[PDB]
Design a protein around this ligand. Structure first.
Ligand SMILES: C[C@@H](Oc1cc[n+]([O-])c2ccccc12)c1cn(-c2ccc(Cl)cc2)nn1
Ligand SMILES: C[C@@H](Oc1cc[n+]([O-])c2ccccc12)c1cn(-c2ccc(Cl)cc2)nn1
Ligand SMILES: C[C@@H](Oc1cc[n+]([O-])c2ccccc12)c1cn(-c2ccc(Cl)cc2)nn1
Ligand SMILES: C[C@@H](Oc1cc[n+]([O-])c2ccccc12)c1cn(-c2ccc(Cl)cc2)nn1
Ligand SMILES: O=c1[nH]cnc2c1ncn2[C@@H]1O[C@H](COP(=O)(O)O)[C@@H](O)[C@H]1O
Ligand SMILES: O=c1[nH]cnc2c1ncn2[C@@H]1O[C@H](COP(=O)(O)O)[C@@H](O)[C@H]1O
Ligand SMILES: O=c1[nH]cnc2c1ncn2[C@@H]1O[C@H](COP(=O)(O)O)[C@@H](O)[C@H]1O
Ligand SMILES: O=c1[nH]cnc2c1ncn2[C@@H]1O[C@H](COP(=O)(O)O)[C@@H](O)[C@H]1O
Lengths: 342, 344, 343, 342
């Protein structure tokens, strides 16, 4: 037992403005998901059964990003959804794999469906199972892009890079539907965990991904400046028409079902997630336009023409509970709906 | 002079950091040494309050691998009969509460004859003369008897109680969900920091520590254990269970059980109170509640790559979280529409 | 030019000590000044909604002392003081403003046999207070004078040299205060009392903790911080011995309570206080019984037979906002009302 | 990517009372807006469309400070507003200029109408556009007084001072209607933001304007004690009757529309501000009277007869959230309304 440090999340921190020569319209958002794979926008959608299936992956890829088809469907149906995505336009497609007995069975299936990236995700990425699971997959298909998750420590990044992972997913406990930190007392405040594993990722030359904890466009900006190659989201996308689950109406307003993959309903081990509903946002292209527009804005403040240039010249400052109340709209009664704020 | 020492944390303040794991949750073991003789299977205890643990809860707790401490608010006669009812119920572990009183020996006499397994000498201020001389007096008449002394919050207290002959120390001044000691007396050390300190001084003297109070989740236990505690004691968590002495009241179709502190006005009426009196939601049976606690503990231990509790304490690293992180930890920005068995 | 982080009572917690003494074995005798002794270290605020004759008579019997407010006629204040004094040798205090007729107001209450005088202005570390205390101690060398309010140990020196026998500490910690908000000035009360007490010990002058004391536990902290006595208005404001008839609002009972720098009380300066209602606490004796019990309990925890030993042995600990949540009752719907804890 | 330090705001700190030979009435609140322009009170109405126009500018100047006519109108109309203020008894007047294609000819027109001060306010003053812009204005009108903003860092003060700016506006994200820190992640908590810029402005000889995040009169004192020469408020003034817009009744209570210059309404796209309604203050003169009462009283505590004596001898102290709770009134049911607290 030893208390090492104080760790921070996104709303603990703020990016200090830099001398700018670029405006939000000239900066680029292209990023390298892995060595082979690059994205025109650094956004991914979460490998969950209430966020991403065929229709969502196609939309995300059509916006320059990429989606990860979840793993709560039968093997036959998983390669089939991958098939639908790759067929229409030859877009980027991701498949979620679990450390199971029929692991190589799915991996063999979606590889046949010409998937771009296998991402195997678990609750505990720094484990004996996932490591050898990566080696097993990477042995059969050496050129296949593997993304392993989830971890929260730089030591974990080392062993996954050693195992053969071409990318890493960072974040234990920061999910909006997550209860891991509550029912297991385990996790690292996302921001600290990200820049800890991102810096360790730069040294070995592997990209890391921030997963969960993002509410606004400004949080993604902080994640990127912390060294993250991309950001994966669930709640921001779950209320979009391209997301699975029908529309439910309660008290006049429209909703979509959203739940963790470790909640009681999804696993149909004690639950490490909850189930609820999220506000229906409309079409994805309208949400992404705001997210992209917000990122370009922040990078313009920090005078970064590229995402590489952002990580190098970004400085963080820590705010308190007082500073956090100042950072949000205050002392006014909001009467008109903003497209990027509550 | 008045000295400001340091910042002290609780369980909501901190987070454990995932280690490399060769271990799955369904594989770890939660065995512990409550004392040198007594070895619990699961590291859970039930509080010795009149709204948590009578013979019913004690039998249920012992059956699940834990232990129950029968409260002392009843008569010496009525308590010995309670302890007995647990002991002759199938070789189960049982404990009884005592206080620094005049009939302290008469009560210890009664429960020792009821073949009680452990003795809990729990008071408001465990680091006092009355508790120290009390333990020495009990031990003088009953050497082989196992004694737990409380409540403490300092390493200095551990040494004095260990010097007196305590077999285990109970740590916690103010973490109680029904407690108002920190509010009316201004005295108390935030539980996590207090647990760590007493654990450390406890290891060196070869005497285990009990984490009492401040826990409302499974993660709180994982932090309590990783901080060097052998067992965690809970009242609020088990008070909602059907094996609790409280009767099932109903408010607006929802069912509740009454829960009060032993220093609350009602509990003392049997006045300057250091506790409050209220009601909590009815949970159901204990074994269903415990099954959720163990599943959370075993899940957390799988994260720190610990097969045993001793391996957890040795290989545990804590990270301090801000309030901003605390909000991120709990499920946020979602209207939860289905009740989870282990979160509310 | 940011010095440090300063704490209030809620930021801090007292660490238990080895104790060979029980809560009812401890003594609350204290030293208000060199010559004035209190059986309990509690004083009632000199406000128009808190302390007049009836309150001061009640505080004195219970062991403490009451300070009659100066928001009235010089004749009246001496009339109030006389009522308290002739009631059987009870300690009585009279607050004095720093005004043109400062002395004339004083002369009246020393004739009515007042025991202590307090010179309370919004800023006790100024020219008026300092030369004021000297003007008073010149005519009355034997009269016990309390000056305030201050928040710096530098101000303790300035007032101790002036001739003040005691200093009152607290800038903007009051329940009705807005000084920290409208002026931006003030020092968190635990830090303020700790600093001024230490410098007070070096000079041999008692300090008074004034404002921001919601609970009996807060009093234990201030006493452990070095304060000779605590002063509160919010606590005693609802009591029946306090000025003001009972207002019935929404079926419940209240008394009016307001700052002396509020628009209501000051009837050119901008308001530095608010005006409000506080629940009717019944009689005074009930409330102080709880307070004394809370103080006596905390001293039992810290192994303190006297208030002196308390200060010498006190260890403090800073708690985060998370510890503050587990300090108060949590995870329970409280039904029965606590006579010493409320929400 | 590294964390710099803890940046505080006004709710984070407290001023410590010094010895005082001066009563609040005996203090002077005069300042230097630039080296050439002086104010009798360090107050300044914000340059937004819903707070300051000719009615407000005259009202502000009549009370002691300046009002700055917003730039959300035609060049002709703005030159006429400046005209309405100047001919109205030779009062101090401020126009507002942005980095735009018609920027120069706009500056030409307001200079013609004898505007006393130009403010070049953009979302990001530490940029190529603003630096080049200030260069041009001083080139054409060497003696014209120009303020530039907004900034948050010392380096930006130097860069603006180098370009000939007579004064700089400090504040990235502290506004009451602001959503910049939320959408971009960019910002510096106003107190240390002002303090660091003020310290470096006093090394060069350039004043700084504490902008935004000022709720109370005490917050203005803290700003002045940190080194700021003047404070700028929109939220405090948008509710007065001299402000633009008609009064609104919602609950039988009077309100006025307050919107950010980067909100959907003001722009006519990605917004950086919100729109809403503020409570109706009434007449500005009675509002200013309360703010002057707070500043002079705060200086009375600090024994400051002047604003420079204030800065020279001002010690700050950080309070926690427990201290913040103690600062505001507590445990009381406020029956009657105070003029300076709500
Ligand atoms: C209950 C369920 O929870 C989850 C199920 C699925 N996902 O993706 C999860 C992600 C993060 C946290 C928990 C998740 C689950 C948890 N575990 C699990 C728990 C602990 C460990 Cl060490 C290894 C695996 N295996 N299944
Ligand atoms: C959305 C809008 O925001 C604003 C528009 C106008 N004003 O005056 C603003 C003042 C403070 C903060 C934001 C403001 C706006 C922002 N930007 C903008 C933002 C960043 C950069 Cl690097 C360059 C330009 N261009 N227009
Ligand atoms: C008010 C009541 O509170 C309690 C009464 C009974 N028990 O078991 C308690 C346990 C923990 C905390 C408080 C308890 C009580 C407190 N004390 C007490 C308080 C301080 C000291 Cl030093 C010694 C005894 N004596 N009775
Ligand atoms: C508004 C009113 O406030 C008060 C007026 C009267 N009293 O006794 C007060 C006591 C404590 C706090 C404020 C008080 C008041 C404040 N001041 C005042 C303010 C600042 C200074 Cl430096 C000196 C005096 N003059 N009148
Ligand atoms: O059942 C769960 N428990 C904990 N974390 C989960 C669960 N399901 C998904 N997650 C994680 O949470 C992320 C989404 O979080 P959000 O975008 O903040 O809503 C996913 O991409 C996963 O990494
Ligand atoms: O009246 C009281 N005052 C203070 N602490 C109490 C009182 N009654 C019980 N406790 C403690 O609070 C613990 C229960 O903690 P909980 O699980 O948070 O309710 C018990 O095991 C006791 O140690
Ligand atoms: O109008 C005021 N402004 C600021 N402080 C005040 C005012 N009136 C009284 N006080 C102080 O507040 C103390 C009581 O504070 P409370 O006990 O927290 O209500 C009094 O003893 C005075 O020192
Ligand atoms: O759309 C906007 N976004 C962010 N800040 C703004 C916007 N419009 C005006 N501001 C700034 O916010 C300040 C007002 O702060 P307030 O008094 O706290 O409302 C103005 O002086 C501007 O400098």
């Amino acid at each position: 037992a030893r208390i090492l440090k104080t760790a921070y999340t996104f709303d603990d921190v703020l990016l200090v403005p830099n001398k700018s020569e670029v405006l939000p319209n000239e900066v680029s958002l292209k990023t390298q998901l892995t060595k082979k794979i690059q994205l025109n926008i650094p956004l991914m959608s979460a490998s969950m059964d209430t966020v991403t299936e065929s229709k969502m992956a196609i939309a995300m890829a059509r916006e320059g990003g990429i989606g990860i088809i979840h793993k709560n469907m039968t093997i036959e149906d998983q390669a089939r959804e991958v098939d639908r995505v790759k067929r229409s336009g030859g877009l980027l497609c991701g498949a979620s794999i679990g450390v199971t007995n029929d692991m190589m069975e799915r991996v063999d299936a979606v590889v046949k469906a010409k998937v771009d990236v296998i991402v195997l995700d678990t609750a505990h990425g720094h484990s004996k199972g996932v490591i050898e699971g990566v080696k097993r997959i990477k042995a059969k298909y050496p050129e296949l892009q593997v993304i392993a998750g989830n971890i929260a420590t730089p030591e974990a990044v080392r062993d996954l890079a050693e195992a053969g992972a071409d990318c890493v997913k960072v974040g234990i406990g920061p999910g909006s539907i997550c209860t891991t930190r509550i029912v297991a007392g385990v996790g690292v405040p996302q921001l600290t965990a990200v820049m800890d594993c991102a810096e360790e990722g730069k040294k070995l030359g592997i990209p890391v991904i921030a997963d969960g904890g993002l509410k606004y466009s400004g949080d993604i900006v902080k994640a990127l400046a912390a060294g993250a190659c991309a950001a994966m989201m669930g709640s921001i996308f779950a209320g979009c028409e391209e997301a699975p689950g029908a529309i439910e109406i309660y008290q006049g307003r429209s909703y979509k079902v959203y739940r963790g993959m470790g909640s009681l309903g999804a696993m149909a081990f004690v639950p490490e997630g909850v189930e609820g509903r999220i506000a229906y946002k409309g079409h994805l292209a309208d949400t992404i336009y705001q997210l992209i527009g917000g990122i370009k804005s922040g990078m313009g403040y920090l005078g970064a023409p590229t995402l590489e240039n952002l990580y190098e010249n970004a400085n963080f400052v820590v705010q308190t509970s007082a500073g956090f109340r100042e950072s949000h709209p205050h002392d006014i009664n909001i009467t008109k709906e903003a497209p990027n704020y509550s």
